[PDB]
Amino acid sequence: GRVEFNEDGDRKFANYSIMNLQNRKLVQVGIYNGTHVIPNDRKIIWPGGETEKPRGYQMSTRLKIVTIHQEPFVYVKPTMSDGTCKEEFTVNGDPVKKVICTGPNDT
Amino acid sequence: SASEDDAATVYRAAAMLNMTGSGYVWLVGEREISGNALRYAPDGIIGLQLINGKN
């Protein structure tokens, strides 16, 4: 086709093919145009489950929160006996919901 | 993007570590699926081809 050297002196608009490992026999599954990708009718079989694209971006349900010693918002108290917080009740009859926090003693 | 020795090595290590399950995205170049590297290639991988790069 057209031969054209870029500022790097290299050929552009090269045609690339896409192959897939289907039981260890290569199968043509797509092509790459000069600037476009044209998949064929062959199925996209993946190592895992569906032929659809697996969203390989994991998530988490355990957040590691950091906070600082703020006098009216974040109070610090040593545990009573072992990792336990004294269940003090407010003047309104509402128990104080505490949380087990791990931090250094001093600077 | 590496040599075929490195490709076979990492395929063997990943097969030992079982990282070829569902959700894994695999994408390799042309140099990575030739020689003995093709031998250790986990199934379901995607490869590219240089058209008429050898004729």
């Epitope: 026999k25 043509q28 | 030739s34």
Partner: antibody, heavy 119, light 114 residues
Amino acid sequence: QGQMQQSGAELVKPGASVKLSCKTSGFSFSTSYINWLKQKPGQSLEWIAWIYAGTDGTSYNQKFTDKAQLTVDTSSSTAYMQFSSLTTDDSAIYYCAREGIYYGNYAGFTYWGQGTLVT
Amino acid sequence: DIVMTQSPSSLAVTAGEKVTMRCKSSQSLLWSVNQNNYLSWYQQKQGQPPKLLIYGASIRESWVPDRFTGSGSGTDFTLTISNVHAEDLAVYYCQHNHGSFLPYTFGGGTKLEI
């Protein structure tokens, strides 16, 4: 239609080496798979090795991994099998065949050479 | 190597009759994910390269007449000819095509006589 032509008959001394040729034509030489099979007379064919021309990927039978070597020439689209340390057990007919693949799924050997007898 | 068992070893019949040839693999050639049998039936005549007859243990080739019928699944397979002709006289081999079950092996073979 694709054609695969093999080399002629060979008389080789025991312990010596032979290198057989298999010219291929009529199809995409680079994007197909070629297999060498050993068939003794009156016996079924024994798979020796397969090679992919597009990537030079080679895989041999364990019985012939240390005995046979495969090479290809893209300019001539000809397959090569070099059999070394030949013994009287190697007195047999060797064939080269092209794999038939449909919809990306291999369906068997669809093309064959004429066969070569090594004595 | 998966052991391919072919039965009968040979048979002789008159033209127009119906024959049956069985193929048994030592292992299941069916892959569960796609439910396809990696079995191929072939027709091999004297002095000629073998001609691919039936693949997948059930699908005839385009050149294969409807008289040929391949059946069986899993480990056991069967090749059946409803109307036997003289031209069909050949040695038929069943061979596995399962890539995960390398190397490719062949059965004992069945010789057809008329």
